């Protein structure tokens, strides 16, 4: 629906929507920008991610409220409404995955862009896995795993251990292990090794880079404290 708007105007409006906390608008603007067909800059990738993370995060929070109510119950209403929110969430995940597949990932040649998009792919398959119950649930989980794994392999070869996207990827892959793959020991081992290797690389960083890296290290620490 955004085909008639200039790319630069879509980007500018995404930034305005973020300031206005209008994340559905933000996501639609960034979808339109992606569909222009040009690669995304560092800042533009972050806008795309923030927009859809906020949209799907609200849907996930609602699905969890409704799923909890449904479990305490077990009329059709709670199930029906949970299913409605679930379908909407799946639609958003499918939209994001479609943007990644057509054609963000294949055009991403630099490590920073390719890891960013593969992390996104793992995340949105993870969100699909959170609600999945059918014949394809194991394949959804393995799709998340495969995307995260490719991102990890690239990040370990091409980025320093303190790189924020490498750290956030490892954080989210550890959450995948703990919550989705029922592999808490893998989750703990990944978080600990990631934290320790970043700690040993902090000395190389400027004050501003140090702030970015230690912020995500604290999230790894919070999970390790929760898990151990």
């Amino acid at each position: 629906a955004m085909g008639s708007m200039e790319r630069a105007s879509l980007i500018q409006k995404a930034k305005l929507a973020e300031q206005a906390e209008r994340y559905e608008d933000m996501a639609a603007f960034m979808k339109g920008a992606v569909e222009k067909g040009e690669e995304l800059s560092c800042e533009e990738r972050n806008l795309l991610s923030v927009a859809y993370k906020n949209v799907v995060g609200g849907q996930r929070a609602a699905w969890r409220v409704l799923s909890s109510i449904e479990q305490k119950s077990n009329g059709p209403e709670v199930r029906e409404y949970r299913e409605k929110v679930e379908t909407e969430l799946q639609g958003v995940c499918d939209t994001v995955l479609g943007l990644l597949d057509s054609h963000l990932i294949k055009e991403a040649g630099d490590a920073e862009s390719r890891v960013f998009y593969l992390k996104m792919k793992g995340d949105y398959y993870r969100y699909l896995a959170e609600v999945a119950t059918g014949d394809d649930k194991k394949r959804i989980i393995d799709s998340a795993r495969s995307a995260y794994q490719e991102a990890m392999d690239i990040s370990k070869k091409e980025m320093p251990p303190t790189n924020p996207i490498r750290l956030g990827l490892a954080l989210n892959f550890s959450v995948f292990h703990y919550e989705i793959a029922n592999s808490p020991e893998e989750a703990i081992s990944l978080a600990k090794t990631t934290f320790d290797e970043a700690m040993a690389d902090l000395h190389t960083l400027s004050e501003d880079s140090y702030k970015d890296s230690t912020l995500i290290m604290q999230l790894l620490r919070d999970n390790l404290t929760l898990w151990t």
Binding site: K53, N172, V175, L219, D222, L226
Partner: peptide, 7 residues
């Protein structure tokens, strides 16, 4: 319950 990446 655990924290995934968030800004």
């Amino acid at each position: 319950r655990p924290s995934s990446w968030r800004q």
